[PDB]
Curated annotation (Swiss-Prot):
Changing R757P: In IMD97; loss of phosphatidylinositol-3,4-bisphosphate 5-kinase activity. Keywords: Angiogenesis, ATP-binding, Cell membrane, Chemotaxis, Cytoplasm, Disease variant, Endocytosis, Immunity, Inflammatory response, Kinase, Lipid metabolism, Membrane, Nucleotide-binding, Phosphoprotein, Serine/threonine-protein kinase, Transferase. The lineage of its organism: Eukaryota, Metazoa, Chordata, Craniata, Vertebrata. Changing R696P: Abolishes protein and lipid kinase activity. Does not abolish interaction with GRK2. This is Phosphatidylinositol 4,5-bisphosphate 3-kinase catalytic subunit gamma isoform. Residues 692-700 are annotated as: Catalytic loop. Candidate target in therapy for inflammatory diseases. Selective inhibitors and protein ablation are anti-inflammatory in multiple disease models such as asthma, rheumatoid arthritis, allergy, systemic lupus erythematosus, airway inflammation, lung injury and pancreatitis. It comes from Homo sapiens (Human). Changing K582R: Loss of kinase activity. Loss of autophosphorylation. Reduced inflammatory reactions but no alterations in cardiac contractility.
Length: 828
């Protein structure tokens, strides 16, 4: 089993047995603590359903999809060898019903995909079916034998200390210091709990040298017993802020931190990295600090009610005053009757006092209203952010998540994984939760893998914790998937090498095109796996490369344009699988943005609205490097312009409509392309405005020959958004005018906008989290408070409607101005 731990390590990209960077045994302890949850989920999953991983949903079929059906008669073409026959099926009839309705043990696998139509669920509740109906595609399935469940086989007293807590600051040491002669530095020690500072003590400013000694006893104002579980000893060096490092004061065994510590610190407000209990691995170049330290048990007046309700009604980002907190607390039993008051109520708690925390735990023991309340993801997410370090509080959040069906877990998987960074300890209810769902479902497990590996590869701050979690998963996912992952990682590594090697050698000369195709030839020949799963789409199995179609794109970061053949013989079309390999950008920012877009879509699904967004696949695999899905038949908006007038930025209003008339043959399809455009344009206008990324160069905007608009390059990020005159022309308008299509556009936008405001809290918390865990450069107070204004928090539906309509009018008044300006900067 020695080559087994080796296998996991090479699959993880980090050695979880390496104890070189620890000052305790929390990590190793967590490895053991996860064994039970690991085996408890492996021994309780249905082998058959787990092997076929049916992808289903319990949500009602949207309205725009019901009208796609004729007589409640959905046609399903079945194949078995070379023959084939169609069948009329009831949307409410099970796959089993269809089976007996066919013969009148075999299962219905989807053609070309590793997807299965199995289980006791209506045919209308399969994602693949809903996908087909939406795209007007025809459902084709092949009849073959169920996968062998054998292939999944798995390898067999603190409260008696009244003393004021204190820490001795021996000094700070650094091998080599910056060439900035010569500043002064002091050490600032904070006792934190959920980004809430309980006490703060500094040292005296000393001359900045490679060795600074203090030997100073910093005595805090907080007693030892009043120390809460999860409290952090935050040590920071100023000059302003240069270094930081954290130390849990209460360990994973409820023991008060004791003894000597030499901690290596991180170099440089609301960043999630600043919360980590991990120390800097680089011991030879990093700043170090030396400290010294020397078990934990387990009727209202009318006016006041109005006041409390008003408080409870405010948005998540609305600051609580001292008065507000005192009201919430004093009336905590009434506040408990409102689930939406929980985040605010638990922010009113003084965790710096044992007596209060005790009363708080008494309160939580009375969870009847919370338990019986319906799941509010936005509300549940709020309790898992940086503002809550109490495991009891956070546990009741993870509690409500338990009722999520695999469908919704996939919706919030990425950000749930990111929320692990907010956990005080490596072992958490959230961590075990992700682990559980990952083992219960292959699709969730697949993406869990890549999301964790994403962080492990380019995050020294949390790679250790995530490595321990990933290892736990890999020891239960099964032999089959362990093999898949292995193949996937192999091909990725090989391709990333080629990407970097190519980038080294603006024009794409022949010497590079030859070298690329040359390199790809060497790999495909006895060096590359014959087949592998597409990481951003586990259903697809890629095969051999199409070297003829492979190229280096004309961008300054020289991304690889790759094309594969579907390794599945039963595949219908002969289209290639397109993947863009790129180094230079942080694709983690793209993942989050795209994930948010998918969330905005499902939200619109609840309102029976359908904006035709194109949230393509984008997986971050390493440092400034990852893969992208290639959308077929798509070109840049700016490129459609460059066709007529390339060099100069002399943009013309009509080109777009011409380009569409050209790429559609029947004129009927042209109208379907225009309508598709009007919707896709509306959605991307609304979604982009809310996220504050609407001001882009139309080179970062693309369109499908079918009229499907969609943005790209979100790493890179005046007008509210992009509504240029050429788009407007396709809508049948130019200046002081209108159109049957423009009236439509304005209608769909207001619908979409008002629909998102119905999930304000949920968007706010996701946006806030996005900045803190994914965008190190965008983590200020005002950076997050943008989305409040964007969603017009605390406004009438009418006002908001007009507010956005004004934003639209701003695009009309600007015309090509901002685009032309983009043309001067980006182009020149
Ligand atoms: C100038 O732009 C061009 C030119 C030619 C083809 C394309 N191809 C694409 N480019 C991008 N961007 C994001 C990923 S990138 O940074 O590696 C490349 C840009 N996304 C795309 C496609 C096709 N599908 N999707 C989702 C773009």
């Amino acid at each position: 089993s020695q080559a087994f731990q080796r296998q996991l390590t090479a699959l993880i990209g980090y050695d979880v047995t390496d104890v070189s960077n620890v000052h305790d045994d929390e990590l190793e302890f967590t490895r053991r603590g996860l064994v039970t949850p690991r085996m408890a989920e492996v021994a309780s999953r249905d082998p058959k359903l787990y092997a076929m991983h049916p992808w289903v949903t319990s949500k009602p079929l949207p309205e725009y999809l019901w009208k796609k059906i004729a007589n409640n008669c959905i046609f399903i073409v079945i194949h078995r060898s070379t023959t084939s026959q169609t069948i009329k099926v009831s949307p409410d009839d099970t796959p089993g019903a269809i089976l007996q309705s066919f013969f009148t043990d075999f299962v219905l696998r989807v053609c070309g995909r590793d997807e299965y139509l199995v289980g006791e669920t209506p045919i209308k509740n399969f994602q693949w079916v809903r996908h087909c109906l939406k795209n007007g595609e025809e459902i084709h399935v092949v009849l073959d034998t169920p996968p062998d469940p054998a292939l999944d086989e798995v390898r067999k007293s603190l409260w008696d200390c009244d003393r004021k807590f204190r820490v001795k600051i021996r000094g700070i040491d650094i091998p080599v210091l910056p060439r900035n002669t010569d500043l002064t530095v002091f050490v600032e020690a904070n006792i934190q709990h959920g980004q809430q500072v309980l006490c703060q003590r500094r040292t005296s400013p000393k001359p900045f040298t490679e060795e600074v000694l203090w030997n100073v006893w910093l005595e805090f104002s907080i007693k030892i017993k009043d120390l809460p579980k999860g409290a952090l000893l935050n040590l920071q060096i100023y000059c302003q802020l240069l270094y930081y490092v954290n130390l849990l004061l209460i360990d994973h065994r409820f023991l008060l931190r004791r003894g000597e510590y030499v901690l290596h610190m991180w170099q440089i407000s609301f960043n999630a990295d600043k919360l980590t209990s991990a120390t800097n691995p680089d011991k030879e170049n990093s700043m170090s600090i030396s400290i010294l330290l020397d078990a934990l048990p387990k009727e209202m007046p009318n006016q006041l009610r109005k006041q409390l309700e008003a408080i409870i009604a405010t948005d998540p980002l609305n600051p609580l005053t001292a008065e507000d907190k005192e009201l919430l607390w004093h009336f905590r039993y009434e506040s408990l009757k409102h689930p939406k008051a929980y985040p605010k109520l638990f922010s009113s708690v003084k965790w710096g006092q044992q007596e209060i925390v005790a009363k708080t735990y008494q309160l939580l023991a009375r969870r009847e209203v919370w338990d019986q309340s319906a799941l509010d993801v936005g509300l549940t997410m709020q309790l898992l952010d940086c503002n809550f370090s109490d495991e009891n509080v956070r546990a009741i959040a993870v509690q409500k998540l338990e009722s999520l069906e695999d469908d919704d877990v996939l919706h919030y998987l990425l950000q749930l994984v990111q929320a692990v960074k907010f956990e005080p300890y490596h072992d958490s209810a959230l961590a075990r939760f992700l682990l559980k769902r990952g083992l219960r479902n292959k699709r969730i497990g697949h993406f869990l893998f890549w999301f964790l590996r994403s962080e492990i590869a380019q995050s020294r701050h949390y790679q250790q914790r995530f490595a321990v979690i990933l290892e736990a998963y890999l020891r239960g996912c099964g032999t089959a998937m362990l093999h898949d992952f292995t193949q996937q990682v192999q091909v990725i590594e090989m391709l990333q090498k080629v990407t970097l090697d190519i980038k080294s050698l603006y024009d794409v000369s022949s010497q590079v095109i030859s070298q690329l195709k040359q390199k790809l030839e060497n790999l495909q020949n006895s060096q590359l796996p014959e087949s592998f799963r597409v990481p951003y789409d586990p259903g697809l199995k890629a095969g051999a490369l199409a070297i003829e179609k492979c190229k280096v794109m004309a961008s300054k970061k020289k991304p690889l344009w790759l094309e594969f053949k579907c390794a599945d013989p039963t595949a219908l079309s002969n289209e290639t699988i397109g993947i863009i390999f790129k180094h230079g950008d942080d694709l983690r920012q793209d993942m989050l943005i795209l994930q948010i877009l998918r969330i905005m879509e499902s939200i619109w699904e609840t309102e029976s609205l359908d904006l035709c967004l194109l949230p393509y696949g984008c997986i971050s695999t390493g440092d400034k490097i990852g893969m992208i899905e290639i959308v077929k038949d798509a070109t840049t908006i700016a490129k459609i312009q460059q066709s007529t007038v390339g060099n100069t930025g002399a943009f013309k209003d009509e080109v777009l409509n011409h380009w569409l008339k050209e790429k559609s043959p029947t004129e009927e399809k042209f109208q379907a392309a225009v309508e598709r455009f009007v919707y896709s344009c509306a959605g991307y206008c609304v979604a982009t405005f809310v996220l504050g990324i609407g001001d882009r160069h139309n080179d970062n905007i693309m369109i499908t020959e079918t009229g499907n608009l969609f943005h790209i390059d979100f790493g890179h990020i005046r007008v509210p958004f992009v509504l240029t005159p050429d788009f407007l022309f396709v809508m049948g308008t130019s200046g002081k005018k209108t159109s049957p299509h423009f009236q439509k556009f304005q209608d769909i936008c207001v619908k979409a906008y008002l629909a998102l405001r119905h999930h304000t809290n949920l968007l706010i918390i996701l946006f806030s989290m996005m900045l803190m865990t994914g965008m190190p450069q965008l983590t200020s107070k005002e950076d997050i408070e943008y989305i409040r204004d964007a969603l017009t928090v605390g406004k009438n539906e009418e006002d908001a409607k007009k507010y956005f309509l004004d934003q639209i009018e701003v695009c009309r008044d600007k015309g090509w101005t901002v685009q032309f300006n983009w043309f001067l900067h980006l182009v020149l």
